[PDB]
Design an enzyme around this catalytic site. Structure first.
Site, PDB file in Angstrom:
ATOM      1  N   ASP A  52       0.814  -1.102  -0.040  1.00 20.74           N
ATOM      2  CA  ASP A  52       0.169  -0.009   0.022  1.00 20.74           C
ATOM      3  C   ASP A  52       0.962   1.342  -0.009  1.00 20.74           C
ATOM      4  OD1 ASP A  52      -2.331   1.761   0.576  1.00 20.74           O
ATOM      5  OD2 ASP A  52      -1.095   2.179   2.297  1.00 20.74           O
ATOM      6  N   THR A  85      -5.081   4.453  -2.694  1.00 23.33           N
ATOM      7  CA  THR A  85      -3.910   5.313  -2.334  1.00 23.33           C
ATOM      8  C   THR A  85      -2.828   4.879  -3.294  1.00 23.33           C
ATOM      9  OG1 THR A  85      -2.653   3.784  -1.100  1.00 23.33           O
ATOM     10  CG2 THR A  85      -4.754   4.193  -0.311  1.00 23.33           C
ATOM     11  N   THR A  86      -2.902   3.770  -3.585  1.00 21.95           N
ATOM     12  CA  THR A  86      -2.050   3.314  -4.889  1.00 21.95           C
ATOM     13  C   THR A  86      -2.540   3.979  -6.184  1.00 21.95           C
ATOM     14  OG1 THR A  86      -3.805   1.764  -5.359  1.00 21.95           O
ATOM     15  CG2 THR A  86      -2.106   1.061  -3.927  1.00 21.95           C
ATOM     16  N   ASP A 386      -7.415  -2.457   5.141  1.00 20.07           N
ATOM     17  CA  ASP A 386      -8.214  -1.651   4.090  1.00 20.07           C
ATOM     18  C   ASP A 386      -9.312  -2.494   3.501  1.00 20.07           C
ATOM     19  OD1 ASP A 386      -6.078  -0.408   4.451  1.00 20.07           O
ATOM     20  OD2 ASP A 386      -4.785  -1.193   2.766  1.00 20.07           O
TER      21      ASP A 386
END
Lengths: 518, 41
Positions: A52, A85-86, A386
């Protein structure tokens, strides 16, 4: 025409762009079903693995200010979504790349943002159009959503087992009715070194990392649980107190009476009929007495000291048992009961407390992590955490979108014509703006090692009538119906990503200079 | 030979957990593609 005297800002702008692009391109490798986790060694000496990007960035010790905001940017995305987020940052940088493009194209940055403000309005509109409303009760689509999130990190190893664990846990803690934004902290994570990631476990009950204090009591059946706050030791006042010795019979009278005090203490506890003891930290003052444990063990009562004040709500949320801080209040009316509870024995001797079955089902729940690599366990839960987040995000909005970049290419396509519609230099900005979204599918084929340009354009060419359902497939290594690949993500995910980026780069443009400070 | 005849025997779980545990680590190490160092403060 008007003449521009200063270039310090423009170059300063360019500096930021070059930084941002470098940053995003560095992260670019890790994303999607073909995302590749990275590793950092701390200057203090710690070592971390991560897939992540946010955690990468919170690990990132960035010197240049701009990406630090980008780093901050993802944290909000993490505080919002959990993956992407990636995706989001590569969107962010890609925008600036085209934002760079327009810079030597001479267009003043202010109009760009408003054009982008318009540019976003179309997209958020479009994304609303393409999404798929889905009620929360459909477990499999949640599951479909789940693994879609999950086949982005290493936990893909036991994804097929991990995904149900996640969703079931959500179902047990949520209300499937109010469609509210239920907190995750009501879910407990248990980082237990060792074991197998396959052996990671769900607990429909309570588990405490701490260890027992009784030598002899190990497993308890039909346990009646008690959580006690007031210490069990020599009575010590908040204010200064001291026994004075000046006489003869003071010795034993004192000596005998403390035990008597302790005796009645335990006597009442047993009188209540509780059989499992919970004791918090009392670090300010005396804890449980050794002597009482002698009695409680003589009374054959399960006991645990040193319970964190922070967990206590969760536990009583978990066990449904209000604690006690005074003897008179300690009563079987409040005495919690459990079907069974005991301390499991793993790690060879890494022993752990388990409490399965509660007559009062708390909404909360805990999660067990097993597996060999210590770092892999931490990354796993990150993926697990997540995984919860996106579900909660999905809980926020009962609308569904396919993952795997199809929304983006639709958008840019949809932007492509709407940009054509719009006149003025804004069109180029939007023309560029759409071209920014072009990156992500290209990244996929990169991490897919497939010819991106041929594929993505063909992805566009198909998608000119190959709407959002279709897209590039990882498993077959081509372009197919991603919905039929069951690779689906909630609407808000990219929404938040798209929205969040938009505001930031606008703020990015308004920058003109950085002044070194004291 | 026949270690079965020779009595050269090993507990099953030894290999069992082994192949598992190596699998995980190999899973871990292979996925890496980049290391970043930090000099101490």
């Amino acid at each position: 025409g008007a003449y521009q005297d200063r270039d310090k800002p423009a170059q300063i702008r360019f500096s930021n762009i070059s930084a941002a692009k470098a940053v995003a391109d560095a992260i670019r490798t890790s994303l999607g079903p073909k995302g590749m986790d990275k590793m950092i060694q701390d200057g203090k000496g710690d070592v971390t693995i991560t897939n992540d990007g946010a955690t990468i960035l919170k690990q990132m010790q960035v010197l240049h200010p701009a990406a630090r905001m980008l780093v901050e940017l993802s944290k909000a995305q993490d505080i919002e979504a959990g993956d992407g987020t990636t995706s989001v940052v590569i969107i962010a940088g890609s925008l600036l790349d085209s934002c760079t493009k327009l810079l030597q194209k001479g267009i003043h940055p202010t109009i760009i943002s408003e054009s982008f403000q318009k540019a976003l309005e179309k997209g958020i509109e479009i994304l609303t159009d393409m999404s798929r409303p889905v009620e929360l009760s459909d477990r499999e689509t949640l599951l479909n959503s789940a693994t879609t999130s999950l086949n982005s990190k290493v936990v893909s190893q036991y994804s097929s087992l991990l995904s149900p664990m996640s969703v079931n846990a959500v179902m047990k803690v949520i209300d499937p009715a109010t469609a509210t934004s239920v907190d995750l902290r009501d879910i407990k994570i248990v980082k237990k070194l060792g074991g197998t990631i396959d052996d990671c476990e769900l607990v429909e009950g309570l588990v405490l990392t701490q260890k027992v204090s009784n030598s002899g009591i190990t497993r308890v059946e039909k346990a009646k649980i008690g959580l006690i706050q007031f210490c069990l030791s020599a009575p010590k006042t908040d204010m200064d107190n001291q026994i004075v010795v000046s006489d003869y019979a003071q010795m034993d009278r004192v000596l005998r009476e403390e035990r008597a005090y302790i005796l009645n203490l335990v006597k009442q506890i047993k009188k209540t009929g509780c059989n499992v003891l919970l004791i918090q930290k009392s670090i300010l003052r005396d804890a449980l007495s050794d002597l009482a444990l002698h009695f409680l063990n003589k009374m054959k009562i399960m006991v645990i000291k040193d319970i964190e004040r922070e967990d206590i709500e969760f536990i009583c949320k978990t066990i449904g048992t209000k604690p006690v801080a005074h003897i008179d209040q300690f009563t079987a009316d409040m005495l919690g009961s459990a079907e069974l509870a005991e301390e499991v024995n793993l790690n060879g001797s890494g022993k752990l407390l388990k409490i399965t079955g509660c007559a009062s089902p708390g909404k909360t729940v805990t999660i067990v992590v097993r597996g060999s690599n210590k770092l892999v366990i931490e990354e796993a839960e990150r993926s697990i955490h997540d995984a919860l987040c996106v579900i909660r995000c999905l809980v926020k909005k009962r609308a569904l979108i396919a993952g795997g970049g199809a929304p983006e290419i639709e958008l840019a396509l949809r932007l492509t014509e709407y940009s054509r519609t719009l006149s003025g230099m804004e069109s180029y900005c939007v023309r560029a703006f759409a071209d920014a979204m072009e990156v992500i599918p290209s990244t996929l084929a990169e991490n897919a090692g497939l010819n991106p340009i041929s594929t993505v354009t063909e992805l566009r060419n198909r998608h000119a009538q190959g709407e959002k359902t279709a897209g590039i497939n990882v498993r077959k290594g081509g372009i197919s119906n991603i919905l039929e690949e069951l690779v689906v993500q909630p609407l808000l995910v990219s929404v938040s990503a798209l929205t969040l980026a938009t505001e930031t780069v606008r703020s990015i443009l308004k920058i003109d200079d950085v002044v070194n400070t004291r | 030979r026949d270690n079965k005849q020779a009595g050269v025997f090993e507990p099953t779980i030894v290999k069992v957990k082994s192949l598992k545990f190596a699998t995980e680590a190999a899973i871990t190490i292979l996925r890496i593609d980049d290391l970043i160092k930090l000099h101490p403060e």
